Structures are given as structure tokens and as C-alpha cells.
Amino acid sequence: AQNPNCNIMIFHPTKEEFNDFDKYIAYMESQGAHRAGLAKIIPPKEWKARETYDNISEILIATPLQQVASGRAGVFTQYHKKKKAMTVGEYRHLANSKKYQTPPHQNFEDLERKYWKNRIYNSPIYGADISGSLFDENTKQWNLGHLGTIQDLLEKECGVVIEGVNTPYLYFGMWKTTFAWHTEDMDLYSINYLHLGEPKTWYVVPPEHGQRLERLARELFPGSSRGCGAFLRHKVALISPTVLKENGIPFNRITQEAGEFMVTFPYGYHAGFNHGFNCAEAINFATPRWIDYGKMASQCSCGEARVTFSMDAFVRILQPERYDLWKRGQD
Ligand SMILES: Oc1ccccc1-c1ccccc1O
Ligand SMILES: O=C(O)CNC(=O)C(=O)O
Ligand code: NI
Numbered sequence: 566a567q568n569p570n571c572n573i574m575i576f577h578p579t580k581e582e583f584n585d586f587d588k589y590i591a592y593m594e595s596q597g598a599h600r601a602g603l604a605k606i607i608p609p610k611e612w613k614a615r616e617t618y619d620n621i622s623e624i625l626i627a628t629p630l631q632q633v634a635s636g637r638a639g640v641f642t643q644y645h646k647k648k649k650a651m652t653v654g655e656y657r658h659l660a661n662s663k664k665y666q667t668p669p670h671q672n673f674e675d676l677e678r679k680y681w682k683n684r685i686y687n688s689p690i691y692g693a694d695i696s697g698s699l700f701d702e703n704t705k706q707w708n709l710g711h712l713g714t715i716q717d718l719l720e721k722e723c724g725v726v727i728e729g730v731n732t733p734y735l736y737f738g739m740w741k742t743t744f745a746w747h748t749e750d751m752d753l754y755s756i757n758y759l760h761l762g763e764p765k766t767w768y769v770v771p772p773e774h775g776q777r778l779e780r781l782a783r784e785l786f787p788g789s790s791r792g793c794g795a796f797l798r799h800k801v802a803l804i805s806p807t808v809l810k811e812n813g814i815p816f817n818r819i820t821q822e823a824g825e826f827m828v829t830f831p832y833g834y835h836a837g838f839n840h841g842f843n844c845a846e847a848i849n850f851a852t853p854r855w856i857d858y859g860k861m862a863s864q865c866s867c868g869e870a871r872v873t874f875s876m877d878a879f880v881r882i883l884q885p886e887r888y889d890l891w892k893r894g895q896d
């Protein structure tokens with residue numbers, strides 16, 4: 566078995582290898598990359614996402630989110646307080662202000678220490694889930710707005726045509742902005758390109774050990790667990806690497822820098838934080854290997870999760886027994 570320790574693997578495709586997206590995902594899996602839950606892909610030196618990022622300041626962040634924490638330094642939840650709209654130029658200025666800017670630090674490890682020590686005492690503002698793309702339309706390789714759709718994958722594999730669409734989202738981050746422990750909707754893959762700015766640190770649990778993380782989360786967030794059998798779908802819970810280690814949860818960590826792709830694999834729990842002002846683009850995707858994960862994916866039906874239009878068909882076709890209860894949750 567390849568990659569039996571479930572290490573995060575890093576890939577350096579050639580420009581020739583970078584032509585066929587599906588083929589390269591399959592290649593990574595042949596080397597055991599999926600066992601980690603997360604892989605890094607460094608594009609060939611000849612590749613670029615777009616010419617420059619000099620003209621992005623007028624993009625609107627319609628609903629910036631202030632991420633307010635509750636709990637203790639290593640075990641906390643966050644809720645999102647809506648703020649007034651601002652442009653990316655305004656957001657960048659805010660990120661760089663004395664109140665929100667990255668503190669002096671020695672290296673990534675020092676900054677990680679500061680993050681887990683001090684995150685809960687601040688409330689950074691995140692411009693997340695903005696529909697759009699920063700890939701040039703002429704970028705033919707690994708263009709996240711030109712991937713095969715999940716709906717077409719399901720049709721190719723299972724023979725049924727379904728409604729729905731599948732487009733990328735932009736994320737503008739600042740120091741301490743946080744993504745909570747989660748797997749993707751319907752335990753899909755995700756791919757994330759860091760377009761510009763400061764790094765993003767990721768934590769990930771191997772898919773074969775996801776239930777260990779779920780069990781710990783139930784113990785650490787007991788009220789939340791009683792409220793919903795799949796409350797990590799709410800994407801509000803954080804657990805530090807120290808607490809994971811104390812509880813014997815297998816995980817890995819890696820820092821993504823500008824110009825690098827990350828892929829998360831089906832049922833790979835992940836969480837992390839941004840180092841400073843940055844912009845990432847991400848989208849979900851599927852492969853034939855995903856179908857069995859989609860069939861088995863947990864669902865939130867308590868009403869909190871509330872997801873895309875397109876998830877309806879996934880649940881309807883892959884999980885018909887769960888569909889009625891889930892759909893009630895979506896109203
Ligand atoms: O300076 C900016 C102003 C506005 C939007 C983006 C940038 C930027 C783009 C790439 C790299 C760094 C940057 O700060
Ligand atoms: O970048 C973020 O804030 C969160 N991204 C993801 O969870 C992802 O790409 O799957
Ligand atoms: Ni994700």
C-alpha cells in the first residue's frame with residue numbers, strides 16, 4: 566500500500582503532466598496521496614494563473630465576516646458577524662492596519678504558536694465565499710473555472726442527468742482568519758489555489774481516521790453534538806494541534822504559499838488559518854472514486870448547515886433514504 570503513514574505529499578508536475586487534470590489527480594492517488602486527506606501541487610515554472618494582480622482592488626466583498634470566538638485557546642467555536650460591504654482595496658488596507666496586521670515573528674512555526682495562543686482574543690474579518698474567478702480565460706491548465714462539473718461526473722458514472730452548476734469561490738483573508746474543521750459538502754474533493762499574498766496553514770486528518778476526529782469533537786463540544794448528529798457540517802469548531810496530539814488524533818500540517826495548489830480528498834477533515842492579507846480561489850470537484858464517499862456522507866438536517874442549490878440532486882440520487890429528512894432541514 567502506497568503512503569501507509571498518510572503523509573502529506575508534494576507534487577511537481579511538468580508542463581506536459583499539467584495538461585490533463587483528471588489524469589494527474591489519478592496519478593497522485595496511485596502514489597497514495599489521498600491517504601493524507603490533503604496534497605500540495607507546485608505548478609511547473611512555465612505556468613501562470615494570470616498576468617498580474619494589479620487590477621483587483623475594485624472587486625466587492627459584499628458581506629465581510631467578523632469571526633468571533635468563544636471557548637478556550639485550543640478548543641473554541643467561532644460565529645460570523647456580518648459587516649458592511651467593502652472593496653478588496655479597502656479590505657487590504659484594513660488587513661494591513663495596526664489592529665489587524667500580522668505581528669513580528671521569526672518564522673512559520675513562531676507564527677503558528679502565536680496563532681493558537683492568541684486567536685480567541687481577536688476577531689479578524691474574512692471575505693469568504695465570493696462567487697468569481699481570478700484565472701485568465703486563456704489559462705488552459707488547472708484553471709479552476711474550467712474544470713469538469715460534478716453534475717457531469719455523476720452523469721458519466723451513474724447515467725442520470727441532474728440539474729445544478731459548479732463554480733469557483735474567492736476568499737480574501739487576513740491574519741488569524743480561520744477555517745473550522747470540516748469535510749466538503751457530500752465529502753467531495755476540493756482544490757484551492759493561493760493567488761496572492763501571505764501563506765495559509767492547513768491541518769488535516771487522514772480520511773481513514775475521520776471518525777476519530779468526530780468522536781473527539783463530540784466530547785469537546787457536547788451541547789453542539791446533542792443538537793446535531795453532524796454538527797461539524799456547521800463549520801464553526803476549532804481544535805488545536807496540541808489538543809489533537811493530547812487525544813491521540815492522527816493529523817498532519819503544511820503551509821501553502823502563493824502560487825501553490827492544495828487538493829483535499831473525500832472525507833479528509835481540514836482546518837487552518839491565514840498568515841496575513843491574501844486571496845485564494847477554491848472549488849469542489851469529483852472523480853469516479855468519490856461516488857462511494859458521496860453515498861456515505863453524513864448530513865446535517867438540524868437546519869444550521871444550509872447549503873447550495875446543487876447539493877439537492879446529490880442527496881436525492883445518492884442518498885434517497887435521507888433525502889426527505891435532509892430537505893426539511895434546508896427549510
Ligand atoms: O497590492 C494589492 C492591492 C490590491 C489588491 C491586490 C494587491 C496585491 C496583489 C498581489 C500581491 C500583493 C498585493 O498586495
Ligand atoms: O481557504 C479557506 O478559507 C477554506 N478552504 C477550504 O476549506 C478548501 O479549499 O477546501
Ligand atoms: Ni474545505
Ligand SMILES: [Zn+2]
Pocket residue numbers: 792793794795796798799865866867868869870
Ligand atoms: Zn446540524
